[PDB]
Amino acid sequence: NGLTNNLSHQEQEYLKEYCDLITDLKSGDLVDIDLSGSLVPPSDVFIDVRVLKDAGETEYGVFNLIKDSQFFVRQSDVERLIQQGYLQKI
């Protein structure tokens, strides 16, 4: 998050309230956090990522996501798209 059905309903109830609660804390910071992801320290600064079944597609500029097209781009937007599994190589 990011940025089943077989399991008991009580879990989903707790789950939905938990995710709503963590979004409340995300609203609190306003730091920004972005505390659920970005686990690996960055370097340096640009990376080459390849598309994973995404076409597509936008943040700051629309980059026109194209299936099976590898790029050379900074870590930033990659962090968001990787959460959806749309990017493959890191």
């Binding site: 700051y60 099976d68 790029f71």
Partner: protein
């Protein structure tokens, strides 16, 4: 225009926040990789487009393009294909067209819109015909001078009709000029230089021709960079010239199989037939090599057999007329894992391109062909050997099937030895799936073309080829041209582009020009027969 200032102009147009915004030939890949590496070194981000479809480009460029400020195109004009329609000197967007084929499209040089002509510094030439194709053409007692003017106009139009209607072929290796340009700036990269050599070796199937005098140019680079004066043993990290031979799969396979699958040795020794079989063993009997010795891997063969190989070749192969073979071709030194001639790595990588992977299935398969390209682009690195060895061995699997089906074709003699042109078709046979790739049939046709005619006088003739399995008689038919055995004697090049334009201008029912390369076209067999009839007559050649 000069490359340097244009290059600086793209640098000026490169860095932006938000960024940025700007198949078969290996000759282009080398140039891409070297320049790509240069800009990544300078951290210049940009888009990478793996073009496949000749007409698909209109479905993509014209679809999603918003903030964009900045081997194909020498034939088709993109101005008509896109409909850019000049909008405001200082136009907002430019499109780079990298192409080595000549003659240039008329709309390319003159009626300059996205170009930024890439002609520098290759074809000057002259080629003074385009001057009268534009300067005279524009802007186009009075009845006499008016009829004189109209007559001269039609005269120049008649001259220009020859131009742009003739077979398109590559003139020279782009990598040479690009490396010269890069070296002008002073950069000499051991990697990049070897890659330049790789690209030049890639097109050797189409002779050299200038490449024969471009040998010292590469040799100069070999002199300008000297890894060591003397050993410097080993060193553990890190090219060299060697007496190379046209023989195929030299280093990873038995000398026996090397000739067995050799395309050059094939027709001369008539390997498909049994007569030359004993003649082959006879060549080994001259070499004094035991049959079991020939079957061993090149690595474990005795040192004596190694050092004496070239002298033995000099003392035996001449009997069969093989005297002109030994060449000083370059050999890379990566040290510890062993040296390989650029030619062999080229064959393996191209083999990696073709294997090692209603209309929706065909497009899906086309998508899979493009999918296999990135595996090759990834394969260009030296350190990633794991994947490379798979393609290296699969190359042998292909060559095995090539020479096998070849013998099958030799027994039935399906060739129609006509005076106009030879025509053939493979309507049925085992392992037809491999024939889907045009490149399969490209080299396959080449393997036939040199086989049926060595020459073997007289009058080398073009071959026709096709195959289909499903998708309602696709029958890809690719053009094929004769190969001379060193005896460019004439500027012949090609014929078919004009003929394809003439027949495609007729009723053209079910015909698909979807193939990016002009030489190959999809056609229904039902309609391929009249297509042949119209091809025979009126014969344009």
């Amino acid at each position: 225009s000069q490359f340097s200032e244009a290059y600086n102009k793209i640098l000026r147009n490169s860095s932006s926040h938000s960024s940025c915004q700007l198949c078969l030939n290996i000759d282009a890949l080398c140039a891409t990789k070297m320049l790509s590496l240069l800009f990544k070194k300078q951290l210049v981000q940009s888009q990478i487009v793996p073009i496949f479809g000749y007409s698909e480009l209109r479905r993509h460029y014209s679809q999603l393009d918003d903030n964009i400020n900045s081997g194909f195109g020498g034939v088709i004009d993109l101005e008509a294909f896109l409909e850019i329609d000049p909008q405001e000197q200082s136009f907002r967007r430019d499109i780079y067209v990298l192409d080595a084929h000549r003659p240039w499209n008329l709309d390319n040089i003159f009626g300059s819109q996205i170009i930024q002509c890439f002609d520098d510094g290759t074809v000057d030439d002259t080629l003074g015909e385009q001057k009268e194709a534009y300067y005279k053409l524009l802007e186009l007692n009075d009845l006499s001078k008016r009829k004189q003017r109209k007559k001269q106009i039609h005269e120049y139009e008649g001259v220009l009709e020859e131009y742009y209607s003739q077979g398109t072929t590559v003139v020279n290796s782009i990598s040479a000029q690009i490396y010269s340009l890069l070296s002008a700036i002073g950069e000499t990269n051991l990697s990049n230089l070897w890659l330049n050599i790789l690209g030049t070796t890639s097109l050797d199937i189409a002779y050299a021709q200038v490449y024969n005098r471009l040998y010292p140019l590469l040799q100069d680079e070999v002199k300008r960079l000297t890894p060591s004066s003397r050993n410097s043993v080993k060193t553990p990290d890190t090219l060299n010239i060697q007496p190379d031979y046209y023989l195929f799969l030299l280093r990873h396979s038995s000398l026996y199989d090397s000739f067995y699958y050799s395309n050059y040795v094939n027709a001369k020794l008539s390997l498909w037939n049994e007569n030359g079989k004993k003649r082959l063993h006879k060549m080994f009997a001259r070499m004094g090599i035991p049959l079991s010795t020939a079957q061993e891997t090149w690595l474990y063969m005795d040192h004596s057999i190694k050092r004496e190989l070239g002298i033995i070749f000099d003392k035996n192969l001449d009997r069969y007329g093989l005297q002109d073979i030994i060449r000083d071709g370059f050999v890379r030194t990566l040290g510890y894992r062993g040296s390989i001639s650029a030619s062999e790595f080229v064959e393996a990588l191209t083999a990696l391109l073709e294997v090692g992977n209603s209309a929706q299935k065909l497009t899906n398969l086309r998508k899979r062909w493009v999918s296999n390209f990135w595996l090759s682009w990834d394969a260009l690195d030296d350190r990633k050997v794991e994947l490379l060895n798979r393609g290296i061995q699969l190359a042998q699997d292909l060559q095995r099937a090539i020479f096998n089906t070849g013998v099958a074709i030799l027994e039935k003699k399906l060739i129609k030895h006509l005076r106009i042109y030879r025509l053939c078709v493979l309507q049925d046979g085992p392992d037809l799936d491999l024939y889907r790739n045009p490149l399969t049939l490209l080299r396959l046709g080449n393997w036939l073309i040199e086989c049926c005619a060595e020459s073997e006088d007289k009058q080398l003739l073009p071959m026709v080829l096709a195959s289909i399995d499903e998708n309602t008689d696709t029958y890809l038919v690719a053009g094929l041209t004769p190969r001379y055995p060193r005896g460019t004697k004439k500027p012949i090049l090609n014929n078919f582009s004009m003929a394809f334009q003439q027949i495609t201008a007729e009723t053209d029912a079910k015909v698909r020009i979807d193939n990016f390369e002009s030489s190959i076209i999809e056609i229904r067999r039902e309609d391929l027969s009249p297509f042949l009839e119209k091809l025979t007559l009126s014969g344009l050649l």
